[PDB]
Amino acid sequence: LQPELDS
Amino acid sequence: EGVFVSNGTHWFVTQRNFYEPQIITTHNTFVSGNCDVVIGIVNNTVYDPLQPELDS
Amino acid sequence: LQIPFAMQMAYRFNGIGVTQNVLYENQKLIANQFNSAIGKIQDSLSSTAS
C-alpha cells in the first residue's frame, strides 16, 4: 500500500 | 479459492464443490507473469478494492 | 462433472502443494514429459520377461 498512499 | 466460470457474459470466481459466484478481485486471485505463456486465457477486468476507496 | 484436462491437472498440482500457475506456465513441457514417460512403458513391457 505504502507508495500508493501518495495518491 | 477455486475456478473461474462464466454464465454467458459475466465472469466469476467460485469454489469447486458448490456453485457460489463471486466478483473477481485482487484478493481472491494472484498474479504470475505475462498473458502470453498460458494456453487458454481470457480478457476480463479484475476489481481492486483498495483503489476506489484510496482515490475517493 | 466435466472439467478441461489442462485444468484437472492444475488442481492435482495444487493438491501436492505446487502453486497451479506452475502447470499453466510449463504446460507443453509437462505434457511432453508425460507422453515420453508413457512411451517408455511400451518398451519396458515389450522387452522384459520378469
Ligand SMILES: *[C@@H]1O[C@H](CO)[C@@H](O[C@@H]2O[C@H](CO)[C@@H](O)[C@H](O)[C@H]2NC(C)=O)[C@H](O)[C@H]1NC(C)=O
Ligand atoms: C450473468 O450474471 C450477471 C450478474 O448476476 C447478470 O447480470 C444481471 O442481470 C439481471 C437480469 O437477469 C439484471 O437485473 C442485473 O441488473 C444484471 N446485473 C449487472 C451487474 O449487470 C446476467 O444477466 C447473467 N446472465 C448472463 C447470460 O450474462
Ligand SMILES: *[C@@H]1O[C@H](CO)[C@@H](O[C@@H]2O[C@H](CO)[C@@H](O)[C@H](O)[C@H]2NC(C)=O)[C@H](O)[C@H]1NC(C)=O
Ligand atoms: C479450446 O480450444 C479452442 C479451439 O478448439 C481454443 O481456441 C483457439 O482455436 C484456434 C483454432 O482451432 C487455434 O488455432 C488457437 O491456437 C486456439 N487458441 C488457444 C489459446 O488454444 C481455445 O482457446 C481453447 N480453450 C481452452 C481453455 O483450452
Ligand SMILES: *[C@@H]1O[C@H](CO)[C@@H](O[C@@H]2O[C@H](CO)[C@@H](O)[C@H](O)[C@H]2NC(C)=O)[C@H](O)[C@H]1NC(C)=O
Ligand atoms: C486481449 O487483450 C489483449 C491486450 O489488449 C489483446 O492483445 C493486443 O492488444 C493491443 C492493445 O492492448 C492491440 O493493439 C493488439 O492489436 C492486440 N493483439 C491482437 C492480435 O489483436 C488481445 O487481442 C485480446 N484478446 C482477445 C481474445 O480479445
Ligand SMILES: *[C@@H]1O[C@H](CO)[C@@H](O[C@@H]2O[C@H](CO)[C@@H](O)[C@H](O)[C@H]2NC(C)=O)[C@H](O)[C@H]1NC(C)=O
Ligand atoms: C527443466 O528440465 C527439462 C528436462 O526435464 C529441460 O527441458 C529440456 O531442455 C533442453 C535444453 O533447452 C531441450 O533440448 C529439451 O528438448 C528439453 N526437454 C523437453 C522435454 O522439452 C528444461 O530446459 C529445464 N528447465 C530449467 C528452467 O531448468
